[PDB]
């Protein structure tokens, strides 16, 4: 109809407003800041036991318990301090590409090509992890999941939607639509009030968990986005895409702040995380390397070489002591 005539007008108005708000680039502001320097991290723990490509991991709030998911159909809860496997959950479906560990540590989530998010109760009376709940309703593969509480979980799926589930009843409390491509990434705000979802339409959308509306959108990438992560402040977030570039966007400025790209890298980013202070942006690539970027200067601070196939998952502890990288070679590596 004629609505496309004003749709492009609104797009141009948004672009003009963003350009008006754009007076000084983040690189210009942080030009006088001295560089972080070389970041040298050595593999402290090599967690072994997975027999297939590892697709996801998530740290615990205690910063020592870890969860990892791989294609051999096992969800392993590790003690990263002693390299001790605390739990090994045999998944109903071997095709899993996401996993989340509850903030209280009582529950763990998993999901994948099967369109169900499985919530497993870790600590029970008998000490055996059991499937607490199975969350169905997505019509596409579950790409990411994150716990808000012990009873609410947000999950992004490949049918271009996200969903906030009440685990008690098992039904979708809220649904988030608006993406035109498969949503691949999902990051929750520190206050669990907002969350950013990156999809295959090269756009990242900020959603409110309560109202269930697309608060705002950021279209800066050229290819599909695979990873996303809030800045520790909660007012910015980084996106990694298959364009072999990361991008730091701001929520209040409602535009792209900085780009992290190099000429020697032409492989996309599969995982993105921030350090405790947010100064270091750790991005895992398809070339089995994790580049640590000066998030304020867009300079490669370091390389976490050591993985064999491809760094599929990456995560920094809440206390910031260590960063764990899990790759397709069926190994977890603690770097510290």
């Amino acid at each position: 109809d004629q609505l496309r005539q004003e749709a492009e007008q609104l797009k141009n108005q948004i672009r003009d407003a963003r350009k008006a708000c754009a007076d000084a680039t983040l690189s210009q502001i942080t030009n006088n800041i001295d560089p972080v320097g070389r970041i040298q991290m050595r593999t402290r723990r090599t967690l072994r036991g997975h027999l297939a490509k590892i697709y996801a991991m998530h740290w615990g709030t205690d910063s020592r318990l870890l969860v990892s998911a791989s294609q051999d159909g096992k969800l392993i809860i590790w003690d990263s301090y002693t390299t001790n496997k605390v739990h090994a959950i045999p998944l109903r479906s071997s095709w899993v590409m996401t996993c989340a560990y509850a903030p209280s540590g009582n529950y763990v989530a998993c999901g994948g090509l099967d369109n169900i998010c499985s919530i497993y109760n870790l600590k029970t009376r008998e000490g055996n992890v059991r499937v607490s709940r199975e969350l169905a309703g997505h019509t596409g593969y579950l790409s990411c999941c994150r716990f808000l509480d012990d009873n609410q979980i947000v999950t992004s799926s490949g049918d271009t939607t996200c969903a906030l589930w009440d685990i008690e009843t098992g039904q979708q409390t809220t649904t988030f639509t608006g993406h035109t491509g498969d949503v691949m990434s999902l990051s929750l705000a520190p206050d669990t009030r907002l969350f950013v979802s990156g999809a295959c339409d090269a756009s990242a959308k900020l959603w409110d968990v309560r109202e269930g509306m697309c608060r705002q959108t950021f279209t800066g990438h050229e290819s599909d986005i695979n990873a996303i992560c809030f800045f520790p402040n909660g007012n910015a977030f980084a996106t990694g895409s298959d364009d072999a570039t990361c991008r730091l966007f701001d929520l209040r400025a409602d535009q792209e702040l900085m780009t992290y790209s190099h000429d020697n890298i032409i492989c996309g980013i599969t995982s993105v995380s921030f350090s405790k202070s947010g100064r270091l942006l750790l991005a895992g690539y398809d070339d089995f390397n994790c580049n640590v970027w000066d998030a304020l200067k867009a300079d490669r601070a370091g390389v976490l070489a050591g993985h064999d196939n491809r760094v599929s998952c990456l995560g920094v502890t809440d206390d910031g002591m260590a960063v764990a990288t899990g790759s397709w070679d069926s190994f977890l590596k603690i770097w510290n």
């Binding site: 708000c21 680039t25 972080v36 991290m41 209040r252 405790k276 947010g278 100064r279």
Partner: peptide, 26 residues
């Protein structure tokens, strides 16, 4: 409502500098 990119850059820089001592990786 949108704030200037200068304000957002300053806020991110201030957060990074205030918590720099508390970052074990940094």
């Amino acid at each position: 409502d949108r704030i200037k990119v200068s304000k957002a850059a300053a806020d991110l820089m201030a957060y990074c500098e205030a918590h720099a001592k508390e970052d074990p990786l940094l």
